[PDB]
Design a protein around this nucleic acid. Structure first.
Lengths: 163, 95, 133, 60
RNA sequence: CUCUUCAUGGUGCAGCCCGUUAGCUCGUCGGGCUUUUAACCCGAAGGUCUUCGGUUCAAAUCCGGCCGAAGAAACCA
RNA sequence: UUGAAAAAAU
RNA sequence: GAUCGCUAUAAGAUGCACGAGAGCGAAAGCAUUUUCAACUGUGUCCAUUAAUCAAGAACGAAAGUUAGGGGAUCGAAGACGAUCAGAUACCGUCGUAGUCCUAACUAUAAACGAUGUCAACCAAGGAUUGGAUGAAA
RNA sequence: GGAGUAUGGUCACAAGGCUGAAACUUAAAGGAAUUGACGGAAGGGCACACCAGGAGUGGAGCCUGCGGCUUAAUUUGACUC
């Protein structure tokens, strides 16, 4: 019997996050070693905001929790990449793209090098100052599309990773 | 003699462009001369998408798609039937 | 009745690694450090060229289902991937064969993700300038 | 344990020469569509016998 | 001197430590494929499995001296 | 998967 | 105790997707983010100061040389395993110089737009990069 | 063609770079397009071409034609479809 009992335990997330128990994790049993080697085994990764906030409007993220950080799912990152626009990314990592317009006819919407830096200075001066980490989404890549819309049109603004 | 007015590439105002690796051969091909193909595919095929839906642990899970861009060389793009030899008049088409 | 080490209904993570030369059906727990059962394509065939065939991949995905049932695992997260480091990012023919076989064995399929590792900026690739002729 | 299926339509002939026909069948037990490679003469009306119905014969 | 191993067509390698009548290639002859040559494929012949005894329903094949080579170790006429 | 060669002038 | 799975560490190299018959540069060439040239604008200034150039000079991909550091991946030579009549090759595994940086050499490319530099005239059309000028908030 | 070769000069640590012939040999070498043929190039159809099969031939005796051998002569034409 390879398993031979072992032991199954429970994972608790902090008390601000609805669901407070995600699942089970297996370990060995007490020997000259120790079972509280469930420390630094904090790499339990859940699609987070669709299985632990119990709502599939958040279902394109991933979280990890020490016994850590968050990351955008791989499918979402590929999907929001557009062929004929400009990719703007800074560092918390946030990524955006130049948008089209209703009356716009020309295919390509490219931002200038100078215009790019303006968007990459606002985006770094409001990710700090709004530096808990504000939790959820609460729509604040929203004064990133309303503060840079004076410079360029932007649609796909996300926060892809926090370390 | 000259078969293509653009010489098979898409570079006009530059002298050098970075190399990339062919998808099938792993062969160094220039970025502008390469054959670019963007493919979108669901991770679960249409024949088996049903079987996942019979036993799904989620409420409104939508199966995502795979996003990869592949670049081929002329030698393997023709062999893989990505592109074909065209008529002398049909070569000028760009649609 | 119940084998030691089993539990009630639980969620696992299935790592289906499918190249054109093998197919790995490997399941762990949500932590990922502890693995339950790992059966490859070559574990079920006696020919080296059959280690990638869908039948071998589908067979190796059936003992994993029955062992997961024995251990009390009733659902699996899927993370399909292929040898896409610098090589082809397309998983082999055994990627889909195992997933359908896992579902057809009366198992709940949770989330599915393609975790094929694409390189941000890679190293050199085998073959040289002229590739594989 | 053999489960039969009803041939619905013929997709074409494959297998180097013409000796194998690709037909999409449904199982009368649960009206489940299945694609199989058929050896021999076949037409839409008749049914087929499938001792194994776990494989999909889409042939890549 | 003690222990152990091997010997098979012209040649080199197979073979079952139980056994019931011995093969794969090169070498020879002939035929097939090819428009023809070279490659390629096939058939036949080629040893009776070192030499003599037992072992039984039968031995290359299990056991004994004998041959004729090999490895380790020992040596007061 | 393997596919080498075909003497000179008429 | 391989392949496989989850973390943590150190250097080396690289700079995906955006990325295009788009931009810059005399050419070679230039893609992670935080001194020079050019166009446009001008009721500014000089006044022919200009063009092309034997000799001469600077820059000049890759490879190569010398001496240090670095040495992850790949890999002229080479060692195996295949295939073959043979294979000293294409195919697979491993692997020295090299591939990276610094200093000094080298000065050649299908270094190509195979199209020398400057100037005048020259049919029709859509679109694009960067300014100026009207309308359109 | 000889040949960017010999020699002379010059640059480099070197590999080599720059300048650079002649003797001799020969009626062509070459450029763009046309038609045909061919492709172990692509696309579309066809044939007992193959597939699913039947009968077989190749193995044996004999009849018969060809080659070879023989002989005074064993007359000769035809040698992939």
């Amino acid at each position: 019997e390879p398993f031979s009992k072992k032991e199954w335990y429970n994972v608790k997330v902090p008390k601000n996050f609805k669901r407070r128990t995600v699942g089970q994790i297996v370990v060995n049993k007490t020997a000259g070693t120790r079972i509280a080697s469930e420390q630094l085994k904090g790499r339990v990764v859940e699609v987070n905001l669709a299985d632990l906030m119990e709502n599939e409007k958040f279902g394109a993220y991933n979280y990890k929790f020490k016994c850590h950080g968050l990351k955008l799912t791989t499918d979402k990152l590929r999907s929001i990449v557009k062929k004929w626009c400009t990719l703007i990314e800074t560092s918390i990592f946030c990524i955006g793209f130049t948008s089209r317009k209703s009356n716009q006819i020309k295919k390509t919407s490219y931002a200038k090098s100078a215009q790019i830096k303006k968007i990459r200075k606002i985006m770094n001066n409001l990710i700090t100052k709004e530096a808990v980490d504000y939790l959820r989404e609460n729509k604040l890549p929203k004064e990133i599309v309303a503060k840079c819309s004076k410079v360029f049109s932007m649609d796909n603004v996300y926060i892809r990773k926090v370390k | 003699t000259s078969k293509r007015r653009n010489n098979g590439r898409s570079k006009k105002g530059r002298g050098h462009t970075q190399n990339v690796r062919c998808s099938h051969c792993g062969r160094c091909v220039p970025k502008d001369k390469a054959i670019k193909r963007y493919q979108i595919k669901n991770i679960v095929e249409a024949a088996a998408v049903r079987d996942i839906s019979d036993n799904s642990a989620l409420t409104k899970y939508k199966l995502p798609k795979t996003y990869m861009k592949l670049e081929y060389c002329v030698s393997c793009g023709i062999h893989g039937r990505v592109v074909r030899v065209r008529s002398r008049t049909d070569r000028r088409n760009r649609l | 009745e119940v084998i030691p080490g089993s539990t009630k209904d639980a969620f696992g993570v299935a790592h289906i690694y499918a190249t054109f030369n093998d197919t790995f059906v490997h399941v762990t727990d949500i932590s990922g450090k502890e693995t339950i059962i790992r059966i490859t394509g070559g574990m079920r065939v006696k020919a080296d060229r059959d280690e990638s065939s869908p039948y071998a991949a589908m067979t190796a995905a059936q003992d994993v289902a029955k062992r997961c049932k024995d251990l009390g695992v009733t659902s699996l997260h899927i993370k399909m991937r292929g040898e896409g480091g610098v090589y082809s990012k397309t998983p082999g023919p055994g990627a889909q064969a195992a997933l359908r076989a896992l579902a057809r064995a009366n198992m709940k399929i949770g989330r599915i993700e393609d975790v094929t590792p694409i390189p941000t900026d890679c190293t050199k690739r085998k073959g040289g300038r002229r590739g594989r002729r | 344990p053999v489960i039969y299926a009803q041939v619905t339509e013929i997709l074409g002939r494959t297998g180097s020469r013409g000796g194998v026909l690709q037909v999409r069948c449904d199982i009368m037990g649960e009206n489940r569509q299945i694609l199989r490679n058929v050896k021999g003469p076949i037409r839409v009306g008749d049914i087929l016998t499938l001792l194994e119905a776990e494989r999909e014969a889409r042939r890549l």
